[PDB]
Amino acid sequence: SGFRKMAFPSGKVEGCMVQVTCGTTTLNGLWLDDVVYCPRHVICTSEDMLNPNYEDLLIRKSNHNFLVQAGNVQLRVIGHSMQNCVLKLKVDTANPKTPKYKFVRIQPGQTFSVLACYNGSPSGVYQCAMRPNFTIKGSFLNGSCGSVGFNIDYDCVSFCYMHHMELPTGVHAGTDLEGNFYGPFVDRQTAQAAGTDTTITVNVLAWLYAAVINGDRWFLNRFTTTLNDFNLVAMKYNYEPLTQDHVDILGPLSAQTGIAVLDMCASLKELLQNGMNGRTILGSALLEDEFTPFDVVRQCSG
Amino acid sequence: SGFRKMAFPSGKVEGCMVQVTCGTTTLNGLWLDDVVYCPRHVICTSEDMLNPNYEDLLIRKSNHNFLVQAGNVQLRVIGHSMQNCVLKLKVDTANPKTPKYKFVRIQPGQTFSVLACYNGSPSGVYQCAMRPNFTIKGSFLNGSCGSVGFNIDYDCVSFCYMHHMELPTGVHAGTDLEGNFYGPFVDRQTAQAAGTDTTITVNVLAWLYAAVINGDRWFLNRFTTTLNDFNLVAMKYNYEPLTQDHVDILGPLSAQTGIAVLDMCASLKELLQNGMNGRTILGSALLEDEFTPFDVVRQCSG
Ligand SMILES: O=C(c1cccn2cncc12)N1CCN(c2ccccc2-c2cccc([N+](=O)[O-])c2)CC1
Numbered sequence A, B: 001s002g003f004r005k006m007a008f009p010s011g012k013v014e015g016c017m018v019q020v021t022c023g024t025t026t027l028n029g030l031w032l033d034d035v036v037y038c039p040r041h042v043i044c045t046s047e048d049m050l051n052p053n054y055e056d057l058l059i060r061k062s063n064h065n066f067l068v069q070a071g072n073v074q075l076r077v078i079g080h081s082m083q084n085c086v087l088k089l090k091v092d093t094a095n096p097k098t099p100k101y102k103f104v105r106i107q108p109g110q111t112f113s114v115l116a117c118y119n120g121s122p123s124g125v126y127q128c129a130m131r132p133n134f135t136i137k138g139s140f141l142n143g144s145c146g147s148v149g150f151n152i153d154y155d156c157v158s159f160c161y162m163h164h165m166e167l168p169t170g171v172h173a174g175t176d177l178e179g180n181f182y183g184p185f186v187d188r189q190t191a192q193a194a195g196t197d198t199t200i201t202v203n204v205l206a207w208l209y210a211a212v213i214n215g216d217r218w219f220l221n222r223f224t225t226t227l228n229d230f231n232l233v234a235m236k237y238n239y240e241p242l243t244q245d246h247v248d249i250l251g252p253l254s255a256q257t258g259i260a261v262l263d264m265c266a267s268l269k270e271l272l273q274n275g276m277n278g279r280t281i282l283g284s285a286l287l288e289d290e291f292t293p294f295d296v297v298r299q300c301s302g
């Protein structure tokens, strides 16, 4: 028992992290097979950063302008190309620690683990969700660009996120590993703002099931709601609408606990209208929305 | 910016995890050099578990009764011994992935990362604190015994925790890596209960400094308190007393923010007496006590 914010073990990704330097600019890269992937903004300086023309910037580089270090070993760059907002540096040596991998783009509402790195060296691991507005509420400092986000299934690492920047509100923005931004963001230092966010309703319900599995029952009640009457209240409180597909996804947890999804929705309705009255659920005094149904099943059965 | 529950990268510990089986009983072990460390309760069955005499149980075992698997490789056991509540199995092969390591016992109030494992295979990583009452609020299922807790400094893994059991309240109990329990607990399936816990005051103050560093200022006020008048309120709310040593430890954060420790204590006094009024700090609607001053400095400067 117990329920924690839990990340995937990071070892397979640690063996892929390298440092990439172009000039005075250093960040992290991901070394898979004989390619290193990194944010293309490594080719900017503070002079360019405001509105770079990346095509011109890259034409003016050569292979020898890129210094890649894997530990103390320098890897020689033998080719370079741009892939949307990612740079691909071909190196003369394939990474012997390359895991089985794929590049997957995730949806808003889904979670992943982040390995935060500085200077090519892994510093910490945490879990987060892709928000409805395509930002992440991460923890990243200067130097952390090129840190990646991932999930692991069996032996295979599905990379989903590469870190590019911090927005003025302190949340984070980045790309998939094909270099395409999540959200309406661009890789320049400008006036960008995260749009309005919403709470991920299916994940709040999943976490209420986790709470019941762990013995927190106080918010349960004898009522039920329709899906439509629930979604009416959802809209008022800035929650995403709950679909029948979401109801279906919560099936396993509803069966484990014996509490119908629309019965749990009546609890959530009550919590939104009334608050918690000073009580807690799974150690929290607010409704948590960054655990998916899959995340809950992972900790609350195995 | 941003502040997350962050664990250490787990790779160095992943390369040490093995499966240990004695009979029908399987759990995890830690393979360092030519020794595997695991909970001695691997030598029990459900028949013994209520009140085992471990000395008699171990005398009746031979090397061949222990099956150790490192992936698909079976490691041959060539010796066995008991070390308090840990079993040490000498194997014929030294682990080539052994990191630099030490075995350290931690204090209540300190944090560490847990690599939760099942069948010798790493499943997830999370961060937690040693509570004042010597339990941990972990996330562990059947099969997770022998999972370890650790911190990393530079290249060196300091192992501090091996998991042994779950108490009736759903919190967790275990040993240091010399086999000595944290807390007044024993490795038998009996009527054990966690004692009364307290909130770790120095860590709450550290997290309030983290909040200020990240732009949450609403709880700040123009007041100050004495240490003695603060500790008076601390006692009422079940918080540990704040020492001058704690004040000294918070020095760096107080200097970074410009807010004296006893000025921050007046904020904490106000939050304890009044609540948050519906507001949040770092994404939480309660006061968080599982980040140390060191943890805060790590994310809020590097
Ligand atoms: O690493 C951080 C960073 C700072 C603070 C908090 N963070 C949390 N996650 C990451 C950070 N950068 C460096 C890169 N930046 C850029 C973003 C878009 C386009 C170009 C650049 C750029 C390129 C060359 C030099 C410079 N430059 O000199 O500023 C900036 C963003 C800020």
Ligand SMILES: O=C(c1cccn2cncc12)N1CCN(c2ccccc2-c2cccc([N+](=O)[O-])c2)CC1
Residues within 6 Å of the ligand: A001, B025, B041, B042, B044, B045, B046, B049, B140, B141, B142, B143, B144, B145, B164, B165, B166, B187, B188, B189
């Ligand atoms: O793995 C879990 C576990 C279950 C549920 C939640 N958990 C969260 N962390 C770990 C768990 N065990 C197995 C070991 N147990 C024991 C604890 C003390 C002394 C002996 C035994 C013992 C030994 C041989 C067989 C059996 N047996 O058959 O029960 C039990 C505790 C329960």
